[PDB]
Design a protein around this ligand. Structure first.
Ligand SMILES: Nc1ncnc2c1ncn2[C@@H]1O[C@H](COP(=O)(O)OP(=O)(O)OP(=O)(O)O)[C@@H](O)[C@H]1O
Ligand SMILES: C/C1=C/C(=O)O[C@@H]2C[C@@H](CC[C@H](C)/C=C\CC1)O[C@@](O)([C@@H]1CSC(=O)N1)C2
Ligand SMILES: C/C1=C/C(=O)O[C@@H]2C[C@@H](CC[C@H](C)/C=C\CC1)O[C@@](O)([C@@H]1CSC(=O)N1)C2
Ligand SMILES: [Ca+2]
Lengths: 119, 373
């Protein structure tokens, strides 16, 4: 199914927003309830930077590598969780502060694996 | 139950093994493999006989003994397989193919080692499910929290591990190859100054016992040295296996002082107090307060009387003047890694994170990187 459908269907439970970002920084799709800086986000991933800022909220990067990004706002405003779709795009999700970023990562990685086949 | 999850915590010196949901490990035994002497290199000779743990030590006169884990890292995989086989069949008496198995690892364990553990568990032992966790992360969890900085010190390695929500923080982990075995060796050395002659492997084991029974960390080292010089108040008697008694004085506190002054054994590293501070400073500015407030000690080499109070003093001197600092030193801390594993493996919300055999079959050994973080 479509890019919008795969990324959009992730918005359930603890996951509140999603964005699919090419390795260039180009946003292929993002849910309409937010607006991510794609170049900033992809550089945090690529360069393993210590924080990611989305819409004025600083999320401290607590785990980052070729396949995963976990960042948490220390003040309690939530998490950013990223997985990679076959080295072609970064799929990120906003996760509610009470949600576990680990289980969110499992779901986001599953969707990233599906996205890889249509990119 | 027929299929209860297993918890194995593999250390440089000791294996701690048992069943998820138990309060303590059922089996604690030395992480050693003994193979017949002079048969390691011999014409037409295979490696058919081997012994593990306490049996290897009992037969030391006919075996060459080796430690498969060095400074917390698996370095001899053939012998490590023997440790695991012994754990399942001889210590726990289970069929590994019938039990999910949670294992532990050092922080910064290389990718190849993580994959090899996973491969061995699925392909050799045919476990139905597996998980691996960082030792310090388990100890922290055992203390009832997921944010803090762990001082983990065992037989082979010491780490400072700052952790936030169960994640060991990027760039901030410190490894120091100074731990219990080095402290035993140092105690043998300084007892020579008193006119004793501890040298052999058997004598090393006696000194390990002296260390565990009589050593402590001085609150102020120079003051303690002055007390030991002026009087006999700190001196203690120790009875050797043959019945002879010796006296130990300032060696009681000079031995573990090495943790705070690694120069005692010619190491250039700063002491564990300073490496704690340095680790905290490599973490996000907004996380540091919570790390200072949650210093957790784990491992056998954190058992010295006085160590928590010494750490409180030393960290207070390094930290900002108003910083709230707390050292948590659980009485159970020689087994807190294992206990953390037991609690985690029994937790309802953890069960989804087991790596299943099916997942291993689909993804291969790198499945460990997908699920164990
Ligand atoms: N009461 C005690 N006082 C001081 N040292 C102790 C005490 N009890 C145990 N130890 C030391 O702790 C070490 C064993 O601890 P532990 O089981 O935590 O280490 P390990 O997991 O085998 O090693 P590592 O974590 O370094 O790989 C030994 O050096 C032992 O002498
Ligand atoms: C590595 C690790 C760390 C940890 O601290 O684990 C604990 C326990 C864990 C149980 C569920 C999780 C999906 C399974 C395993 C993660 C265990 O929940 C946590 O991840 C979450 C994050 S903060 C919290 O309170 N619970 C923390
Ligand atoms: C009781 C016990 C404690 C221990 O920590 O044991 C572990 C493992 C042990 C293996 C060799 C030893 C002869 C066998 C059994 C002793 C096991 O080596 C140690 O004693 C080493 C050598 S001296 C020392 O401090 N650590 C640590
Ligand atoms: Ca250990």
């Amino acid at each position: 199914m479509s890019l919008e459908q795969l990324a959009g269907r992730l918005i359930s439970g603890d996951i509140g927003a999603t964005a699919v970002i090419k390795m260039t920084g180009e946003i292929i799709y993002q849910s309409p309830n937010w607006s991510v800086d794609g170049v900033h986000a992809i550089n945090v991933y690529k360069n393993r930077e210590p924080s990611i800022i989305i819409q004025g909220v600083k999320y401290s990067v607590i785990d980052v590598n070729e396949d995963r990004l976990i960042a948490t706002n220390v003040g309690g405003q939530g998490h950013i969780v990223g997985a990679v779709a076959g080295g072609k795009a970064l799929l990120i999700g906003y996760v509610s502060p009470n949600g576990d970023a680990r289980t969110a990562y499992i779901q986001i990685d599953k969707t990233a694996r599906q996205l890889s086949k249509i990119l | 139950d027929e299929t209860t999850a297993l918890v194995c915590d593999n250390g440089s010196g000791l294996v701690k093994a048992g069943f998820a949901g138990d309060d303590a490990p059922r089996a604690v035994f030395p992480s050693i493999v003994g193979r017949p002497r002079h048969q390691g290199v011999m014409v037409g000779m295979g490696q058919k006989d081997s012994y593990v743990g306490d049996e290897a030590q009992s037969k030391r006169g006919i075996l060459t003994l080796k430690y498969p884990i060095e400074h917390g890292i698996i370095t001899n995989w053939d012998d490590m397989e023997k440790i695991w086989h012994h754990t399942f069949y001889n210590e726990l008496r289970v069929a590994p193919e019938e039990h999910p198995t949670l294992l532990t690892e050092a922080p910064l364990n290389p990718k190849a080692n993580r994959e090899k553990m996973t491969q061995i568990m699925f392909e050799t032992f045919n476990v139905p499910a597996m998980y691996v966790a960082i030792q310090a992360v388990l100890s922290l969890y055992a203390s009832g929290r997921t944010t803090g900085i762990v001082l983990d010190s065992g037989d082979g390695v010491t780490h400072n591990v700052p952790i936030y929500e169960g994640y060991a923080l990027p760039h901030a982990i410190m490894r120091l190859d100074l731990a219990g075995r080095d402290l035993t060796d140092y105690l043998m050395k300084i007892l020579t100054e008193r006119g004793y002659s501890f040298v052999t492997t058997a004598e090393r084991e006696i000194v390990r016992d002296i260390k565990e029974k009589l050593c402590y960390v001085a609150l102020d080292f120079e003051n303690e040295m002055a007390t030991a010089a002026s009087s006999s108040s700190l001196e203690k008697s120790y009875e050797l296996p043959d019945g002879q008694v010796i006296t130990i004085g300032n060696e009681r506190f000079r031995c573990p002082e090495t943790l705070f002054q690694p120069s005692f054994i010619g190491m250039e590293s700063a002491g564990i107090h300073e490496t704690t501070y340095n680790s905290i400073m490599k973490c996000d500015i907004d996380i540091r307060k919570d790390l200072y407030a949650n210093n957790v000690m784990s491992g056998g080499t954190t058992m010295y009387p006085g160590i928590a109070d010494r750490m409180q003093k030393e960290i207070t001197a390094l930290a900002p003047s108003t910083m709230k600092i707390k050292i948590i030193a659980p009485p159970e801390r020689k087994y807190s890694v294992w206990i953390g594993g037991s609690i985690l493996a029994s937790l309802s919300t953890f069960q989804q994170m087991w790596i299943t055999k099916q997942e291993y079959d689909e993804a291969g050994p790198s499945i460990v990187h997908r699920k164990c973080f």
